[model samples]
Target: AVPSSKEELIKAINSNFSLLNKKLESITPQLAFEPLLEGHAKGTTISVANLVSYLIGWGELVLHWHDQEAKGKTIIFPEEGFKWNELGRLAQKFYRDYEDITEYEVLLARLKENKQQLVALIERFSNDELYGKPWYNKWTRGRMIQFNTASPYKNASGRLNKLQKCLAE
Candidate 1:
């Protein structure tokens, strides 16, 4: 769902989920050969499948965080002792996980499922639950609710922008 009010939040989570696939569908299959260019701390050449998997990996982590918090369990911001500053390590791990996924369908299917689950989770939130504070964590910062609203969509939009570059080339 493209956000309804806040540009693309609060709107169509499912709609936008389908929109992602629609956008991907517009891409020519041969474009996967474009040699996954740009946007990595390391100078390695990642394939399209691996590059695409990054969003799904992060989306899953975000969901897990909320799930843990909801269950009254302690939550780690990114990972144990790993500040957001160490995102490079996490990013590399996510990229590394999918280097073995040679199949495009597998990546797309996994990404779609991630989106589905994320939307389901988001839909469960009420206006207060989404816009207000959720579980208590003294270390919590940011718009709390927006970790659900903005974060994953940020990845989805970011991925679209990168893929759009493929179309341009």
Candidate 2:
């Protein structure tokens, strides 16, 4: 179910992230860079590292949006150079963003850090601020956060779980 309040929203995000993180941690380093999972693009595949990077990218973008708002700067939907419809390109950019990092542990640590910071940001907002009014388009702030955080976490968990099962077989 979708969370309506700040508390429920936080709980959803944390719980989803915890589950996904656990599964991510279970991936062996030898298989971390293997392109076993389906990619964002059709007829392509992505590595576990690329998947983690994709998650981290969105998490960081959420934080960046809040930061920009705090600084009285205009918020860019998705990112500066990418449009909403160009998310596949955005995903590719995300994969490239962390391409230099080869260590699975480091990528995992970065994802954890991004998730922690996002939760801390969420804590600073009230229930009203989160769900009282629309913050972006017709979506409330709470919904926006959940869209990027809990939703993706849940989706990623499913993908990773399926991959894990396939490997086991």
Candidate 3:
């Protein structure tokens, strides 16, 4: 349930500590980062936001090819290639790869996957940088950053944490 008051919201955060700590503690040192978080360039831009737009613009064609591309593979990017230590890098990858498609179930599963990846980022921060703008980067190949939106943090963090633990175990 959504918190009815600010105090409740704060309480919710406090209450989730052990679980959050478990997720944070459970992370092995190696799976902490991936490419987009590490290098290449804020130099030329080309990030997940840009990637999303290009995918959507391609419509079913993008979806058709991409849906089959991974063949239901799910691995954390940090474990793969990119760095997840940087704030929003997981999200950048999410929107980057998920730019196309109208299928919520498909996209949501992917998005939830992305959100699972985000906990490492979240637990790694106590500041507002993660929610900050993507100003320094500009490769908006697909969609612009949806600043008006809320993230899956409040609703899905725990469930995603469980998934991460399950997969790790």
Candidate 4:
């Protein structure tokens, strides 16, 4: 279930991010680029690097949205060029965003940094500000943050675990 309060939401994000980070730390650079059949995109394979990129992309977006909202700018859902239903394309764009970087450790560090920034951002909001009312459509601020951060971290960890098991066999 989605977290309803700021504290629970932060806890969820931190714990899940820890799990995902641990799983990522276990993977070697050589293995990180190996294409796997597990992921959210249909008929597409994603490497560990691609998976991490996807997570970082969403995390950065959450921060971006919050920053924009704080600045009193109109927020665009998902992104300017993408819609809610076109998230698969967004995922691919995320993968491409870091394609120039070949170092797995670099990607891991970026992910950690982004997660830290997100947690800090969450800490700035009160419970009511996070959950008292809808910040975007019917979703609360906390819900939006969780949807892009904690939930995806949990999902990515599961996918990485499955991939590890397959590699072990």
Highest TM-score against the true fold, candidate: 2
Residues 15-58 of candidate 2 have per-residue lDDT tens digits of 99999999989888769899888776689999999989999999
lDDT of 1 by residue, 3-50 (tens): 323224434555555666666656565665356655556576654555
Per-residue CA lDDT of model 4 for 90-112, tens digit only, reads 99899898887799999999999
Q: After superposition, how far is residue 99 of candidate 2 from its true place, in Å?
A: 1.3
Which stretch of 10 consecutive residues in model 4 shows the poorest summed lDDT? Answer: 36-45
User: What is the number of backbone collisions in each predicted candidate, taken in the order shown?
Assistant: 6, 0, 20, 0
lDDT winner among the candidates?
Answer: 2
Clashing residue pairs found in predicted model 4: none
Order of models, best TM-score first? 2, 4, 1, 3
lDDT of all predictions, in order shown?
0.62, 0.92, 0.35, 0.88
For residue 31, model 2's alpha carbon misses the true position, in angstroms, by 0.2
Query: Which clashing pairs does model 2 show?
Result: none
Candidate 2 TM-score over all chains jointly: 0.97
Score every model by TM-score. Answer: 0.71, 0.97, 0.27, 0.95
- Rank candidates, lDDT, best first: 2, 4, 1, 3
Clashing pairs in 1: 1-12, 1-13, 1-16, 3-8, 3-9, 4-11
Clash count in backbone of candidate 2: 0
User: With candidate 1 superimposed using the best TM-score fit, by how many Å does residue 13's alpha carbon deviate from the native?
Assistant: 3.7
